[PDB]
Design a protein around this ligand. Structure first.
Ligand SMILES: *[C@@H]1O[C@H](CO[C@@H]2O[C@@H](C)[C@@H](O)[C@@H](O)[C@@H]2O)[C@@H](O[C@@H]2O[C@H](CO)[C@@H](O[C@@H]3O[C@H](CO[C@H]4O[C@H](CO)[C@@H](O)[C@H](O)[C@@H]4O)[C@@H](O)[C@H](O[C@H]4O[C@H](CO)[C@@H](O)[C@H](O)[C@@H]4O)[C@@H]3O)[C@H](O)[C@H]2NC(C)=O)[C@H](O)[C@H]1NC(C)=O
Ligand SMILES: *[C@@H]1O[C@H](CO[C@@H]2O[C@@H](C)[C@@H](O)[C@@H](O)[C@@H]2O)[C@@H](O[C@@H]2O[C@H](CO)[C@@H](O[C@@H]3O[C@H](CO[C@H]4O[C@H](CO)[C@@H](O)[C@H](O)[C@@H]4O)[C@@H](O)[C@H](O[C@H]4O[C@H](CO)[C@@H](O)[C@H](O)[C@@H]4O)[C@@H]3O)[C@H](O)[C@H]2NC(C)=O)[C@H](O)[C@H]1NC(C)=O
Ligand code: HEM
Ligand code: HEM
Ligand SMILES: *[C@@H]1O[C@H](CO)[C@@H](O)[C@H](O)[C@H]1NC(C)=O
Ligand SMILES: *[C@@H]1O[C@H](CO)[C@@H](O)[C@H](O)[C@H]1NC(C)=O
Ligand SMILES: *[C@@H]1O[C@H](CO)[C@@H](O)[C@H](O)[C@H]1NC(C)=O
Ligand SMILES: *[C@@H]1O[C@H](CO)[C@@H](O)[C@H](O)[C@H]1NC(C)=O
Ligand SMILES: [C-]#N
Ligand SMILES: [C-]#N
Ligand SMILES: [C-]#N
Ligand SMILES: [C-]#N
Ligand SMILES: [Ca+2]
Ligand SMILES: [Ca+2]
Ligand SMILES: [Cl-]
Ligand SMILES: [Cl-]
Lengths: 104, 466, 104, 466
């Protein structure tokens, strides 16, 4: 890292001079809690048939969505104190913060 | 195994299985496509699998400039010394700039309308075209950079292309920071959580880890609960712009052709300002436009965003609801009755217990968006904690935070305190009447609107090198 | 991880049910602070000629030992309140807690 | 390549450079051998390099039983159903068991006395032969395991080999926990840091991360400052055991032939009990037996333990002194004057600044062992914080902690509270006079000593299966 600079690097590298990659692009996320995988280190809960999580069957994500999230659109409540721009800035800001790559 | 065309569960695919009596997918041999997030250390029998952030965690407008050097270079107009970002060479929006087109192998935007042949847009981030409202925001910031570079060139004749680009990029970054922390976050968190997690800024602390936490990538998806089922477009007097003022969201995903051929970003920006967001209620969590018909036009089957969020948290090995509550110093309900009290909703607690068996296993997004919203906020205690904690780190652990001593002069900071999203819209579009601040609260025309001529522009005088 | 168990596994696996590799053998150490490497991710300070650490030259470990650690052996002070067993238990205990492997 | 036979700086080596005018290594172009610790994710350009713990972090006597299944099985006597650990088949120590020999490729123990041809010992941990005093402790616990298995077999005739082994192993692990937390840690940290970092145990907490922290591997090396330049051996009346009662440490490293051919573990254990440890003082930090002559008989030149500790911290990417002071909530000295105040020694502060330039760069081990010792403790505030913090996590985060509900019965817990190292020595050796508790403080014969016959045996009645 340069002893002195004038602007941000494009990758975020060198923002933190003691630990140059912190906040820089193409680096693993930090973990605020230890990860919880079916095998302890790699497989996601719900991977292996019949394997429970913490004493209970893993609920299908699509089943949770159908039973708890799904609702009749005519019931929609327009937020009287928020604009749709509130939603949009949120997504734009998200896209300044994180993108988690996947294989093509 | 092709995760998009097969339902076989083999690396790197983790397809979502279909439950019996599904309201849409009656064929249980089908599935919802899902690719596992790339592991930070592929094939290891030593490391605990982690995922990768391809972007800079800092609030530095990397969605405008790019987070990698080759891209950042390609997004720049290198044909002169004006320090501008490259603009679309084939199309304009009422004489104004559009983002350049991208060159993608399998362009999804092309599939949203075969005969229009409008590819996806090229931006600092790869998702600029995911919805036309987002593209409009990217396009707005591209224009503001070029507008800033132009004024700067007049004030400082000796500044070369590089200097103009960096100075305009530095201003845009501070604008994203100001709009986000001054206007946006207080309305996300509410007053109490805002004061608790974002106390008054002191100065740069090089011991504050600024990385995005893996959990934040799923928790901040709370915004999915704010999504309306339509894209609303309004004409210059804020009336439904004919003949298609309310397009179903399932026909706008990656529909870049709508920006180019259906009136530019003005109708879209006016729609965002004068239409209410959707409110998150405990039995009105997220709409079927994203729950049943996500990306329906650009693939074999419509996805389910809420379900993807939950499958993603599992892919990422994220702890369940009670573990995150504990992390946050919040009580951890163990019975349906205790969960009922925490959610102030017994009926929702029962549904969650029927699905999960225990509040320990509730997936973080589901548990987070299930909590009652904090007063004057749009997230509950758990999400407020995760989101508030993340943004304080992105602020305090950023050496280039706009208020950090040495980044801007006192008069430059005084000037920047006058910026606003409404003004930026005024400076870069044909829109002459915009929302009063706070733009994220105002949503009713004409009650909440004012003339652009009443909003003082950013005064760049203190940027004079003289 | 078995629903119930009466004894520790040999690897330490399954001690923590929710994250079964925690405390288990042949896993990465946890970090209490972000790592500080010359290039931000791998090379140790003292690796590249001329690369300072935070504004100052990297002090040779051998120089620090010579200048600060070295002392005349006949000056050794016996601890009137600790036995050499206190030294030895510490090493024995250390060998229950950690061994950082190296290539042979 | 061989990092032991050349000074080329290339993977996986990181040789220690030599300062001009070194009092021992006169050719400045040479070096001290050093292999970089194995990376958790080999060759990655994404991950931040981290190191690996080959052992279980729990205080579970894994140095006796092994931390990997094949080894654990090989350490056991599978010739019968008695649940015993294998013992040496070629040599005994006055009729008592010795650890079996290992089968190593370049066995370092054979080099310490070429004519004796005694190889290194096989134990749960690979370092059992590093010094004979360590070997004696490993041998002591192996015998105690077999002693326990034998008694449990009389108590419970129907228990098979697996049951007897597991039950004996369980008691041994509990013994190591009690001696460590009841007798050892209080004398390391002092009463004040003991109360702060290790408050009364309440319950197993499955949210406490029990992993060893990278910094602890270096910080717990504070113990190197305790090492005496000799191995002391004493006869049955605690008088010097001729003809060699005081052997220079540089001739006992990996000297497994001394345990086998020079009187077994009894003279060694008596020497550990009746000899003072070395006291750490600010101008008497570590002896030349380890600083100039470490592993002299098995390396091309003598190594320097203090220097290796500092090079290891850099290999591991560990933050400097002030970052750890900050992590621990302790003031961070920024000037030589401030450092002088913190260390209560301006002379030492000046020396550290001449070497490091800034207290920000002082290596964790060096800065840690430089701090003045806490009252009735043998580490300063920084090391007390790191070490205390680590042991609380190993206690609270251990589902098999001896005091955790369901591990032992109340009556078994009452029996275990009576165990002590002096009694364990009495039960497994020919020594009939041992130290008064606390064994780690007691160090002067006959003043601090008592007859083994005054110490009651561990009562195993409550292990009888009704
Ligand atoms: C079981 O043990 C759990 C772990 O406890 C730790 O380790 C043991 C061995 C003890 O030493 C213990 O003292 C340690 O805390 C324990 O859970 C822990 O509980 C604490 C207290 O609630 C949690 O702290 C809170 O954290 C949140 C989240 O931010 C934290 O993490 C970020 C990211 O790393 C850091 O940057 C932050 O500094 C935090 O460390 C904070 O928001 C919160 O602070 C805010 O609220 C408090 C209270 O109003 C205010 O005083 C503050 O100013 C803030 O406004 C706390 O700091 C901790 O996260 C949590 N850890 C885990 C792993 O869950 C649990 O309580 C124990 N249970 C029992 C029954 O003993
Ligand atoms: C610059 O920022 C530093 C980071 O601060 C955090 O993040 C920012 C954004 C804020 O949210 C801030 O509030 C956060 O704390 C900051 O350094 C931090 O300072 C705190 C307080 O001194 C440190 O906490 C102390 O930690 C030690 C070590 O244990 C910790 O880590 C282990 C391992 O992960 C955990 O298991 C523990 O739960 C702790 O989290 C503790 O020993 C100590 O607690 C003990 O002492 C206190 C005080 O007597 C008692 O009340 C307790 O009961 C214990 O006896 C503290 O919890 C924190 O480690 C440190 N972080 C870093 C990275 O250094 C710094 O102060 C900021 N500077 C300025 C000028 O703002
Ligand atoms: C136009 C509105 C939005 C979408 C369309 C949309 C879509 C997604 C999709 C497809 C994902 C990935 C799902 C998966 O895990 O497979 C997704 C991820 C994330 N979002 Fe989305 N989102 C829209 C809108 C929002 C809003 C308003 C957000 C926040 C206020 C928001 C956030 C996020 C985040 C942080 C992620 C993860 C990003 C990453 O890759 O790290 N979204 N969204
Ligand atoms: C007989 C006394 C001791 C030694 C001989 C000895 C030697 C070492 C060596 C060679 C290392 C590695 C140095 C390097 O980094 O290249 C080392 C590491 C550790 N020690 Fe040592 N040690 C003796 C005695 C002690 C005592 C009394 C300790 C604690 C009270 C102590 C601790 C440690 C620790 C924790 C390590 C790191 C272990 C790991 O591999 O993770 N040592 N010591
Ligand atoms: C670069 O800038 C000039 C001047 O504004 C403009 O005419 C040209 O089209 C730009 N090129 C690109 C690729 O944007
Ligand atoms: C597709 O784009 C064309 C312009 O080429 C437009 O006329 C048509 O209406 C669009 N299709 C739909 C279904 O809107
Ligand atoms: C196994 O136990 C028997 C009986 O104690 C003993 O004779 C034999 O030597 C032991 N074998 C080993 C390898 O220790
Ligand atoms: C080596 O061991 C033999 C016994 O095998 C012993 O007689 C001799 O003294 C030892 N060598 C040294 C240098 O002590
Ligand atoms: C969402 N992107
Ligand atoms: C592209 N223009
Ligand atoms: C020390 N080992
Ligand atoms: C070897 N026995
Ligand atoms: Ca960014
Ligand atoms: Ca262990
Ligand atoms: Cl996380
Ligand atoms: Cl660490």
């Amino acid at each position: 890292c340069p002893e002195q600079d004038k602007y941000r690097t494009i990758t975020g590298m060198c923002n933190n001079r003691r630990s140059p990659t912190l906040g820089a692009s193409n680096r693993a996320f930090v973990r605020w809690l230890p990860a919880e995988y079916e095998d302890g280190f790699s497989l996601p809960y719900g991977w292996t048939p019949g394997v429970k999580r913490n004493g209970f069957p893993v609920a299908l994500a699509r089943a949770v969505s159908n039973e708890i999230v799904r609702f009749p659109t005519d019931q929609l409540t327009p937020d009287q104190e928020r604009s749709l721009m509130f939603m949009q800035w949120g997504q734009l800001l998200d896209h300044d913060l994180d993108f988690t790559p996947e294989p093509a | 195994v092709n995760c998009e065309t097969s339902c076989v569960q083999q690396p790197p695919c983790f397809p979502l299985k279909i439950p019996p009596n599904d309201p849409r997918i009656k064929n249980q041999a089908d599935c919802i496509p899902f690719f596992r997030s790339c592991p930070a250390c592929p094939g290891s029998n030593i490391t605990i699998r982690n995922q990768i952030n391809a972007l800079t965690s800092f609030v530095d407008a990397s969605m405008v400039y790019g987070s990698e050097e080759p891209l950042a270079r390609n997004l720049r107009n290198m044909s002169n010394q004006l320090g501008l970002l490259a603009v679309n060479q084939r199309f304009q929006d009422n004489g104004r700039a559009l983002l350049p087109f991208d060159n993608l192998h399998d362009d999804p935007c092309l599939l949203t309308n075969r005969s229009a042949r409008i590819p996806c847009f090229l931006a600092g981030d790869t998702r600029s075209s995911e919805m036309p409202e987002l593209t409009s925001m990217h396009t707005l910031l591209l224009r503001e950079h070029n507008r800033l570079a132009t004024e700067l060139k007049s004030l400082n004749p000796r500044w070369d292309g590089e200097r103009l680009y960096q100075e305009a990029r530095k201003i845009v970054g501070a604008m994203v920071q100001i709009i986000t922390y001054r206007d946006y976050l207080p309305l996300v968190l509410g007053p109490t959580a805002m004061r608790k997690y974002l106390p008054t800024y002191r100065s740069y602390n090089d011991s504050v880890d600024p990385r995005i936490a893996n959990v934040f990538t799923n928790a901040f998806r709370y915004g999915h609960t704010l999504i309306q089922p339509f894209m609303f477009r309004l004409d210059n007097r804020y009336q439904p712009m004919e003949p298609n003022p309310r397009v179903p969201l399932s026909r706008v995903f990656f529909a870049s052709w709508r920006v180019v051929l259906e009136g530019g970003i003005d109708p879209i920006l006016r729609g965002l300002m004068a239409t209410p967001a959707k409110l998150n209620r405990q039995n009105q969590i997220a709409v079927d436009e994203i729950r049943e018909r996500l990306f329906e036009q650009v693939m074999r089957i419509g996805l389910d965003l809420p379900a993807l969020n939950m499958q993603r948290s599992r892919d990422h090995g994220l702890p369940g609801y009670n573990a995150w509550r504990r992390f946050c110093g919040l009580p951890q309900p163990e019975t349906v009755g205790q969960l009922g009290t925490v959610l102030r909703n017994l009926k929702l607690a029962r549904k969650l217990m029927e699905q999960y068996g225990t509040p320990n296993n509730i997936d973080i997004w589901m548990g987070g968006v299930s909590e009652p919203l904090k007063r004057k906020g749009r997230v509950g205690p758990l999400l407020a904690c995760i989101i508030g904690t993340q943004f304080r780190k992105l602020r305090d652990g950023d050496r280039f935070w706009w208020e950090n001593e040495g980044v801007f002069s006192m008069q430059q900071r005084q000037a920047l305190a006058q910026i606003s999203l409404p003004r930026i819209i005024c400076d870069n579009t044909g829109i002459t009447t915009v929302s009063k601040n706070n733009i994220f609260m105002s949503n009713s025309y004409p009650r909440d609107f004012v003339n652009c001529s009443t909003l003082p522009a950013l005064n760049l005088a203190s940027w004079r090198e003289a």
